[PDB]
Amino acid sequence: VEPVVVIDGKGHLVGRLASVVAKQLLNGQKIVVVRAEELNISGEFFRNKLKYHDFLRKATAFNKTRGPFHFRAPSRIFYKALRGMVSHKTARGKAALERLKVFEGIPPPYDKKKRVVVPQALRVLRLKPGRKYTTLGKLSTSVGWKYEDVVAKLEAKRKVSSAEYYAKKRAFTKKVASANATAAESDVAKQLAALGY
């Protein structure tokens, strides 16, 4: 339905988002993941910090620079979730990894474009209320991400830059929802309601 949708990572379970994301890449769809620092993982924070430290212990013994690269960014933690869910060792999976961009915050030009959600991968619609969940920004800061503060600073700039956009968007929406009702109660309006619009 769209050449590229931009998926918000806010309130998303990581593996449940990455699985439907990985199916979308292998079905020839370009998708971009923004706000990967607000991704959620089910389980306690100490459970997932110990889970990452178990992963971080795994490195090649004779040479550490060619081993498993334990990436500490939330975008690259999410990228590590995609790998394994995609057949990245073949040229089809390399093309699937080529069509995917995962980002911290919402960088340009994706700040001024429509962010979609995956409702059956959301933490709200999948976790039982009362379970403990870990946000990816807090987890990545504990394991070695050095950029929690600047992504939080740039998101604070982007949030008010988009709040003023929505302020004039409400102004135009108020004007157009007054104008259509002003153009209503006529022959063209009642006929269009009769057909079903």
């Binding site: 339905v1 292998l26 079905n27 020839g28 769809q29 089809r92 699937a96």
Partner: protein, 106 residues
């Protein structure tokens, strides 16, 4: 009009396969907007063209085509099976195919 589309877009997902064996004779097509096999029953028998581009011209066109048709549904999620005259090249796992509305039944 700026829209001249008489077909519906579909994605060539993969070959009809087992876990470790694929059969390139019949392919799997995910038609856009279709989610049930009951609503995918409309699309059986309809023609599928994989429309692609080569570099040199053959009959006055760089556009070439592989023709096929939907044979049956495949699964519970609107994926259908398509048999082509010449099979799909397996580089098109995710390319757009065109499911025309002919042969129609309306």
């Amino acid at each position: 009009a700026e829209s001249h589309r008489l077909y519906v877009k579909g994605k060539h997902l993969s070959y009809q396969r087992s876990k470790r064996v694929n059969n390139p004779n019949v392919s799997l097509i995910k038609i856009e907007g279709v989610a049930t096999p009951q609503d995918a029953q409309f699309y059986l028998g309809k023609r599928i063209a994989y429309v692609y581009r080569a570099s040199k011209e053959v009959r006055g066109s760089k556009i070439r085509v592989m023709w096929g048709k939907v044979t049956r549904t495949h699964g519970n999620s609107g994926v259908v099976r398509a048999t082509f005259r010449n099979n799909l090249p397996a580089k098109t796992f995710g390319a757009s195919v065109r499911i025309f509305l002919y042969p129609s039944n309306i």
